Amino acid sequence: SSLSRFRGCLAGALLGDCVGSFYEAHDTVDLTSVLRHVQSLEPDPGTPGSERTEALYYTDDTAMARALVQSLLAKEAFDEVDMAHRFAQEYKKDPDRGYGAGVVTVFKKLLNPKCRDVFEPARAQFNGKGSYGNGGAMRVAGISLAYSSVQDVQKFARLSAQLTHASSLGYNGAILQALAVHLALQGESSSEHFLKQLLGHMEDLEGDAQSVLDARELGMEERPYSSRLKKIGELLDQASVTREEVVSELGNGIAAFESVPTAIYCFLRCMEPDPEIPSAFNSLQRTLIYSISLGGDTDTIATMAGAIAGAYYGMDQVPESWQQSCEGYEETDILAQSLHRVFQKS
Length: 346
Ligand SMILES: Nc1ncnc2c1ncn2[C@@H]1O[C@H](COP(=O)(O)OP(=O)(O)OC[C@H]2O[C@H](O)[C@H](O)[C@@H]2O)[C@@H](O)[C@H]1O
Ligand SMILES: [Mg+2]
Ligand SMILES: [Mg+2]
Prior knowledge:
Elements: H1 2-20, H2 31-39, H3 60-75, H4 80-93, H5 103-110, H6 120-124, H7 135-138, H8 141-146, H9 150-162, H10 168-185, H11 191-206, H12 209-216, H13 224-237, H14 243-250, H15 260-269, H16 283-293, H17 298-313, H18 320-323, H19 329-344
Helix pairs in contact: 1-17, 1-19, 2-16, 3-4, 3-19, 4-5, 9-10, 10-11, 10-17, 11-13, 13-15, 15-16, 15-17, 16-17
């Protein structure tokens, strides 16, 4: 059902944040360690729920995702002023959730009720060049639950990201992540078709003059997203790719272009079984485990891979033992059901 996909989307994102935050900024993560971390969430056979109820705290990924969804519900539409002020007020209420070091400046400016233009603080970041961080993408999944057409998904993924990420290196990653969640909601089962659809959009977007200018500020590659999506096509066809090669080809970092394609690769790769991951796990669990085993920005890569996998596999593959380990999981589910009731209905 679509309700199952909405609930699974936000729960998968919560799972990625809460489980992956344990490994944040670890340059190397052992797969066995991740397996043991999630095995520790399981109660004895016969006991419902989690062995560690709400023991895994969420971070800024979830705090901002919740503010974004709460704005969409409050206004029953994207409203940039409402969402900007909700981001600022959420940061003020609970600043110690692990926010990016730079974006805090934006939140502080947006606390001013006489800030006339809520996009101006983001435009000022990094000497006016804009943030390329993955914070615009980590929170964007709600956009793809609220809006059904790809035109609207792109439009409002971009605007919602531009409240904090004015560089196209940041907001194009948010658009790519929103498009991937959108495709997963449609049940797109062919990894080739999934990639082809994303690539068509990203080549169009990265042809824009300002997108090229933003990318050239950082280095030689002018189409960071399109280049990585083509790499993903190649990687998926290899019988064996090491984690080291995956990270070398795509990244595992805080930059949106070093994390959003990686999350997409993890989802597409873990459609198939993995001999290193016990067969008892389902495909959503496999996706989260593998993504965290890549290391780096594990909380955000896992929250994005989990949003996609949750939208694709639905709540049936969200295990209660994992879900009920996450701080605020009931509120997350209520928010997902509310988005469904307001925007989707059946
Ligand atoms: N144009 C830029 N130039 C130089 N450094 C940059 C630039 N853009 C980003 N940085 C660096 O990128 C950092 C973060 O960018 P930020 O906009 O503050 O916030 P986020 O919301 O995207 O957080 C990104 C992730 O960081 C945490 O893990 C969070 O949980 C996110 O998962 C800056 O402090 C800079 O060092
Ligand atoms: Mg975080
Ligand atoms: Mg992070």
